[PDB]
Ligand binder design. Structure first.
Ligand SMILES: CC(C)=CCC/C(C)=C/CC/C(C)=C\CO[C@H](COP(=O)(O)O)C(=O)O
Ligand SMILES: CC(C)=CCC/C(C)=C/CC/C(C)=C\CO[C@H](COP(=O)(O)O)C(=O)O
Ligand SMILES: [Mg+2]
Ligand SMILES: [Mg+2]
Lengths: 252, 253
């Protein structure tokens, strides 16, 4: 089992062509809706299906069968992305293909910078057989713009874009530490395309670059891909009744 | 649950104890009877801990379990293990040790030695040892100074450049932001510069413990490093000779 070493999911993400990736928030989207959506993501040619949320409760009982339902609807890898909690580490269920592990390098709390990784691995393998564990995508996770919700929960401070001083320290770490991916997110604003370009230029060729937050149009997805993003994530745009139209436009 | 990666009794002792020299016993070179004699003297000198460390090791578990037990029966000081990790295994460990010092080699060109060894070690935990009996882990930034192809070939390290403070300032930002417990400045063939020790002491938080070692063979050197801000000054080789009692008295007196 690869665990923290590169595996099948990371290989797929590295080799697939860049594009949009829909993120289903499993604690807001009913499982029947997730299944309907998952069937469409496959036809569009997305690289993976992310299940992600800032908030979660009764994770294992909700997510094991949620992941199973989604996996019965799409052959794409199902990747989980959730924040860790002291005393538990990151949440995990059998059946997920991978867990995206965010090292929040901009956080003022060392547990969220990386000690959560130590707690998670200490607890491994736990209740899930070693051979059945998801792979781990080690990721540098950075936040942009005013965001007191993530700041209060995880201790993050928005990355300064007044100069490249802070981001260059994060690129040195991403490279020296051999992170698999970088995830640039903005809860309330937009990650600047020029920051995406700076990261693409500074990262190694096998490091995968995700950008998400308030992406709601195909124009935005194109602009981020043109700026160097490997994957452009979007959740909220499809959390409405007319999601099929929205999905077509964003993926068009 | 064992503290493991969280601060525990050993880190508290290192943070609160008076700064001073710390003798490092290489257990794969020093006979256990001699280690036991040495441990008794270290206790009399009031050192903060006894470190057992080596770059080289084989048959770790069968050798170290009884070695650690012998040393523990001879001193009440915490016994801390410090050895490099090996891919496929992570860091070596035996029951009975009070703590393992875990070096994150931030200057290595190999990400396994920069930090993934930590992930492998914790993934393997608890393994063959009962959770409640596991040693505490001291998360440490480990940096190397001076020409050192042995560590370079083994662990991927590149000597820290001191022609500017750019490289060490980057390590200090990591040490602080990642909440490392300790920083270990080592020179296999030269001497860590006292001015680098001062830069690290001024740049670290008050609870971060600063160790310096490598080629310390005199009390004058220990004093200079302590004056520069080191919390502990390690020395192994100076006592690897017959007249070690005189050498110890000069380094500690
Ligand atoms: C802070 C961080 C990067 C990681 C820590 C773990 C953490 C909080 C994981 C949850 C996923 C996340 C970063 C944001 C939630 O929604 C956005 C889609 O935004 P939109 O609805 O605007 O499309 C997404 O899933 O990307
Ligand atoms: C490179 C590094 C810092 C950590 C990786 C793990 C690693 C190689 C651990 C072994 C311990 C070590 C750093 C050096 C060996 O001897 C000196 C004392 O030298 P002296 O005989 O000159 O007194 C010591 O133990 O400190
Ligand atoms: Mg949510
Ligand atoms: Mg474990």
């Amino acid at each position: 089992p690869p665990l923290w070493r590169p595996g099948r999911v990371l290989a797929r993400l590295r080799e697939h062509q860049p594009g949009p990736v829909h993120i289903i928030d499993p604690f807001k989207v009913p499982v029947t809706e997730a299944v309907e959506k998952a069937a469409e993501l496959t036809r569009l040619g997305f690289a993976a299906v992310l299940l992600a949320s800032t908030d979660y409760e009764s994770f294992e009982s909700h997510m094991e069968p949620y992941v199973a339902a989604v996996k019965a609807a799409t052959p794409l890898p199902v990747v989980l992305h959730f924040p860790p909690r002291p005393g538990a580490g990151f949440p995990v269920v059998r059946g997920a293909d991978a867990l995206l592990l965010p090292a929040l390098l901009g956080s003022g709390d060392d547990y969220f910078v990386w000690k959560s990784f130590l707690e998670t691995l200490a607890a491994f393998p736990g209740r899930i057989p070693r051979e059945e564990w998801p792979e781990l995508l080690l990721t540098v996770a950075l936040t942009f713009g005013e965001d007191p919700r993530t700041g209060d929960l995880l201790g993050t401070v928005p990355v300064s874009t007044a100069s490249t001083e802070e981001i260059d320290r994060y690129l040195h770490v991403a490279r020296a530490f051999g992170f698999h991916m970088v995830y640039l997110y903005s809860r309330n604003e937009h990650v600047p395309p020029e920051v995406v370009r700076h990261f693409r230029k500074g990262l190694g060729p096998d490091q995968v670059l995700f950008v998400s937050g308030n992406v709601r149009s195909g124009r935005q997805v194109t602009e981020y891909l043109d700026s160097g993003a490997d994957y452009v994530g979007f959740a909220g745009a499809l959390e409405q009744p007319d999601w099929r139209s929205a999905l077509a436009e964003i993926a068009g």
